[PDB]
């Protein structure tokens, strides 16, 4: 038997679906979302880490000159300084008084730990939602891992389940992303081959193990001071270390809809938005023949107490009379009130009690025990507590019933004014018809 429903994408909300097959007693099965995960598809642009400047010993040629030789090294700098006269601890070498020369070289490289401490720059698109759902009905109670798209069918107790695509296409990750350790930054980074000194990305590499490197750190050589050997230089400090101090916030602490950002792999979890369509295919052994199901007549519903709090703050009593003792399946045909359970024990004594949660001043909903029906209406009082550590068990429906006190009063007033208008219309009609008849 095929059935289709829609359940809210809320973790911990007890969804209950009511199946009413023509030949069998009604069935109520409970579905709950234990967990959720939403992962974008990432393709790596480059990585960044702190650099390291390589400065070899200067070549001081005495009594002669040297020539600078170009090399294919990242941000390579080389210059030749003439007229040097260095000293060392024992004396001054370069016997020639002023026909000497020094060669200074410097380049940059990735730091020795770039495979341990680095940041990845990604582009994110087309997230896929996975879920973990517990389904329970009859003697079946079991939890499954599913892909939330119309392209994954699972079997639970012989029943086939397909959890269709999510209602909305909202994702918290925008086009460009930067990942550092276990923190995701919702950032726009410079293109590859176009990094700037002192900012994020002043050195860029396609992969951790890649061999070529791009570097732009404004490294510049300077003339050595007279009488000493040292190779001076100036270089703008690392842009990775500057990002580490001026990165700003994170997506972990900003994300809407209250969802946790995890890394490795990058994902957003328990992120309450949208609805999940569900398609079902049940066997005939899930139901019960309407013969051995109990027969209930004269179903009366009276509300004992009500207070529209987050938990199950209303109590409900049903009176009936039955021919045989057995089990029935209760259900509330409105989302104004959410019931605690999906099954009751019927006995010849004729009294069952059950708990419901609502959020409106005066609810009115129809409840059904096996095949019977009844209408329940109540007047509920506000709670006194201001703040609670748990989420609502209701659907946040507030608009009151037409028989409730507020709308009853409005109905009385509007009816009085309408009667006044109708009477005046009749008076004018009679007078104008008399005027016409003359």
């Amino acid at each position: 038997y095929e059935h289709s429903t829609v359940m809210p994408n809320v973790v911990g909300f007890p969804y209950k679906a009511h199946i009413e097959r023509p030949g069998y007693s009604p069935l109520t099965l409970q579905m709950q979302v234990v967990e959720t995960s939403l992962e974008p598809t990432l393709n790596l642009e480059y990585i960044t880490c702190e650099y390291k400047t390589v400065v070899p010993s200067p070549y001081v040629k005495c009594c002669g000159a040297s020539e600078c030789s170009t090399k294919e090294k990242p941000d390579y700098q080389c210059k030749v300084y003439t007229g040097v006269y260095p000293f060392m601890w024992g004396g001054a070498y370069c016997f020639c008084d002023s026909e000497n020369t020094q060669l200074s070289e410097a380049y940059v490289d990735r730091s020795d730990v770039c495979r341990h401490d680095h940041a990845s720059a990604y582009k994110a698109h087309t997230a896929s939602l996975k879920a973990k759902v517990r389904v329970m009905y009859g003697n079946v109670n079991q939890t499954v891992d599913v892909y939330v798209n119309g392209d994954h069918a699972v079997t639970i107790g012989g029943t086939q389940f397909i959890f269709g695509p999510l209602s909305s296409a909202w994702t918290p990750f925008d086009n460009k992303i930067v990942v550092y350790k276990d923190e995701v930054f919702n950032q726009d980074f410079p293109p590859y081959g176009s990094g700037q000194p002192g900012r994020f990305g002043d050195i860029q590499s396609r992969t951790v193990e890649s061999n070529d490197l791009y570097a732009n750190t404004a490294l510049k050589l300077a003339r050595p001071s007279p009488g000493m050997v040292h190779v001076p230089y100036t270089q703008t400090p690392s842009g990775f270390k500057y990002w580490l101090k001026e990165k700003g916030t994170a997506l972990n602490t900003k994300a809407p809809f209250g969802c946790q950002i995890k890394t490795n792999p990058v994902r957003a979890m328990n992120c309450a938005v949208g609805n999940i369509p569900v398609s079902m295919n049940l066997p005939d052994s899930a139901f019960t023949r309407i013969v051995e199901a109990p027969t209930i007549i004269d179903l009366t519903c009276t509300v004992a107490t009500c207070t529209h709090s987050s938990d199950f703050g209303g109590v409900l009593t049903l009176t009936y009379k039955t021919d045989k003792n057995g089990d029935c399946s209760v259900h509330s045909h409105s989302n104004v009130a959410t019931l605690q359970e999906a099954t009751a024990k019927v006995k010849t004594a004729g009294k069952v009690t059950l708990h419901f949660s609502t959020a409106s001043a005066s609810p009115s909903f129809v409840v059904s025990l096996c095949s019977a029906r009844a209408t329940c209406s109540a007047s509920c009082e506000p709670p006194k507590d201001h703040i609670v550590p748990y989420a609502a068990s209701h659907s946040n429906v507030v608009f009151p019933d037409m028989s409730g006190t507020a709308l009853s009063w409005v109905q009385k007033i509007s009816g009085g004014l309408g009667a006044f208008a109708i009477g005046a219309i009749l008076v004018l009609v009679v007078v104008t018809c008399i005027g016409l008849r003359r």
Binding site: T253, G258, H308, S309, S310, A359, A361, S362, S379, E381, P382, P383, K384, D385, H386, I387, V388, P389, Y390, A391, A392, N396, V398, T405, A406, W409
Partner: protein
């Protein structure tokens, strides 16, 4: 602030904590008509005035 959607605070190394607000107000429903308006003004205090 703690709206009805909830709020989350993280303080130190220990785990973040969530809090939700209830639909609490100061009037009394099912009372005189000048108290029902107070009830519906305590919560949603911007469409009640327009509707009235």
């Amino acid at each position: 602030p703690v709206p009805v959607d909830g709020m989350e605070y993280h303080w130190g190394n220990n785990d973040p904590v969530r809090l939700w607000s209830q639909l609490t107000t100061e009037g009394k429903p099912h009372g005189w008509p000048h108290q029902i308006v107070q009830y519906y003004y305590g919560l949603y205090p911007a469409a009640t005035v327009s509707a009235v």
